[PDB]
Amino acid sequence: VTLFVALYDYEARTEDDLSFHKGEKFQIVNNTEGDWWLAHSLTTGETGYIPSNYVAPV
């Protein structure tokens, strides 16, 4: 798999997005539905949407 790392902090503003800190890592669950990706945080274990331009491949 290809993990992703947060480049910037992000504060959630909806029910289905994740808040995350710079440096947090994610496993991507789905990225075939646009620039907001369904992701699973390796820190919190939560799953939710993240803005794809806020992460980079590890």
Phi, psi of 54 (to 5 degrees): -90, 0
If phi > 0 it is left, if psi is from -120 to 50 it is alpha, else beta; for residue 40 that is beta
Angle, vertex CA 56, rays to CA 7 and CA 6, nearest 5: 35
Determine the distance from the C-alpha atom of residue 18 to the mean position of all C-alpha atoms in its chain, rounded to a whole number: 7
Resolution number, Å: 0.9
H or E element, residue 5: strand 3-6
User: Considering just the CA atoms, what is the radius of gyration of the chain in Å?
Assistant: 10
Dig out the tokens for 47 from the structure.
């799953």
What technique was this entry resolved by? X-ray
Distances (CA, A) of 22 to 15, 16, 32, 43, 52: 21, 19, 24, 12, 13
